[PDB]
């Protein structure tokens, strides 16, 4: 690494600094004073104090990226968001008066809820002890399941069975399916929760 150990990661949170000194606790006052002495790394290209910034969508875009072509990944992400928005508007214009109150048109809300609906809380850990592999249930950390939902969504959208259907169109369809607890990603979560319930007797190996 080209940064010395003294260098610390920057804090881009804009409203953190505007906090009144009166609200600051003694510990928070101390750490604010301490950061004065520390050296701070240059903020990386990426996160910004923008009010429209979304770390989850940024991570999804980075996970779609191939060969460092970030422009194309962000283009695909924004196209997916626009497609979801337009599909929801089309479904809203054609809905009954009482059905328009339960139709979400915010693409960010749909994206977050669809990813949350696919998060597995339990997983397996291959462990060979007696000469034969043994899959044991283990509770998944929050970061692990957040990553797994994204990875499953992207892998499902990268299947070759979808011939000539462009990535934004496939991803919008999968997101809207997972928003309603439907589709193959929700089934992949269910088949993991079931295959980890089928081996609850193997937890004693942990």
């Amino acid at each position: 690494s080209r940064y010395s150990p003294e260098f610390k990661d920057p804090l881009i949170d804009k409203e953190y600094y505007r906090k009144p000194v009166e609200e600051l606790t003694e510990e928070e006052k101390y750490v604010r004073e301490l950061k004065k002495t520390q050296l701070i790394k240059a903020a990386p290209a990426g996160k910004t104090s923008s009010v429209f910034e979304d770390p989850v969508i940024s991570k999804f875009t980075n996970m779609m990226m191939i060969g460092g072509n970030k422009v194309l990944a962000r283009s695909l992400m924004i196209q997916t968001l626009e497609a979801v928005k337009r599909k929801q508007f089309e479904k809203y214009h054609a809905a009954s008066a009482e059905e328009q109150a339960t139709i979400e048109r915010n693409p960010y809300t749909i994206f977050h809820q669809a990813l949350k609906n696919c998060e597995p809380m339990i997983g397996l850990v291959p462990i060979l002890k007696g000469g034969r592999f043994y899959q044991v249930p283990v509770p998944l950390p929050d970061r692990r399941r957040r990553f797994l939902a994204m990875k499953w969504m992207i892998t499902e959208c990268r299947d070759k069975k979808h011939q000539r259907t462009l990535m934004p169109e496939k991803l919008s369809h999968k997101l809207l399916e997972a928003f309603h607890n439907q589709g193959p990603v929700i089934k992949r979560k269910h088949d993991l929760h079931k295959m980890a319930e089928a081996n609850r007797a193997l937890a004693h190996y942990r």
Binding site: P10, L11, K14, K36, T37, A45, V71, R74
Partner: protein, 292 residues
């Protein structure tokens, strides 16, 4: 081991050499100073060795020689100090003084002195536990309503933490021929190098190589990077920027321009806002470059 006669002679040779160097440089020996010694020795005997102590030096023998010899008793044998037989007369005398001040008070950014330099001040070796006890007494004295003599006494035993990293250099404010105030700054990211001029008053117009920023930077990511500095301190649309960038690519040029604008914008914001920008990473050069 250096005998006192040896040090006396070396003082003599240093004095005669000082007058000799003053003669050589043509300066008046009477007012010739130690800084003059250092400068003249650097000139006569140039040395770019990085270790400053490996370069030529002609210092007063007192500073060079670590010879110490203190007599604790006279010819009659009576020790000078009343705490001599403790073996730590300096330390226990200091503790006695501190305890007496604590009794008197009872009747009524910086760091603590580290163990080794406390030993140097006392000229006596001491352990960890007695150092801790002394520091505890000093802290207790601080807790009480210390008066004048007390807090300069404590200040004797507190060094300065000269590591305040809030030392961003605020660019001076210059004035153009039209009388408008502005500030210029530089920045570098990978092979891209940028120089930005930020005006105190403006309407949010950024000119990159004489081209509007939305035309010079088609990609929204670069425009967000150019936003980050002004947005962080709530002055979007309040300044004009004229920047020149060369080398590197799209992202490197955007980052260099961001750094340049942040460093130039430091002039028109408060010190607290400068520190907030520093803690956000807006004023640090990115050192990550391609590796061989």
């Amino acid at each position: 081991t250096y005998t006192e006669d040896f040090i006396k002679k070396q003082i003599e040779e240093f004095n005669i050499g000082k007058r000799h160097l003053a003669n050589m440089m043509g300066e008046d020996p009477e007012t010739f100073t130690q800084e003059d010694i250092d400068r003249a020795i650097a000139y006569l005997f140039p040395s770019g060795l990085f270790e400053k102590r490996a370069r030529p030096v002609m210092k007063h023998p007192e500073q060079i020689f670590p010879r110490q010899r203190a007599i604790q008793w006279g010819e009659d044998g009576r020790p000078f100090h009343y705490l001599f037989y403790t073996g730590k007369q300096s330390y226990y005398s200091l503790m006695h003084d501190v305890y007496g001040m604590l009794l008197n008070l009872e009747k009524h950014g910086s760091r603590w002195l580290i163990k080794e330099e406390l030993e140097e001040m006392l000229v006596e070796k001491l352990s960890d536990l007695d150092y801790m006890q002394f520091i505890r007494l000093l802290e207790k004295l601080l807790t009480s309503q210390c008066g004048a003599a007390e807090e300069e006494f404590v200040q004797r035993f507190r060094r300065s933490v000269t590591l305040e990293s809030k030392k961003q250099l605020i660019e001076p404010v210059q004035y153009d021929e039209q009388g408008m105030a502005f500030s210029k700054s530089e920045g570098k990211r990978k092979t891209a190098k940028a120089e930005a001029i930020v005006y105190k008053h403006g309407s949010g117009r950024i000119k990159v190589n004489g081209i509007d920023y939305q035309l010079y930077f088609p990609i929204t990511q670069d425009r967000e990077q150019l936003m980050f500095p002004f947005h962080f301190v709530d002055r979007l649309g309040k300044h004009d920027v004229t920047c020149t960038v060369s080398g590197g690519g799209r992202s490197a040029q955007a980052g260099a321009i961001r750094l340049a604008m942040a460093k130039a914008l430091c002039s028109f914001v408060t010190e607290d806002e400068v520190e907030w920008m520093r803690q956000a990473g807006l004023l640090t050069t990115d050192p990550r470059v391609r590796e061989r």
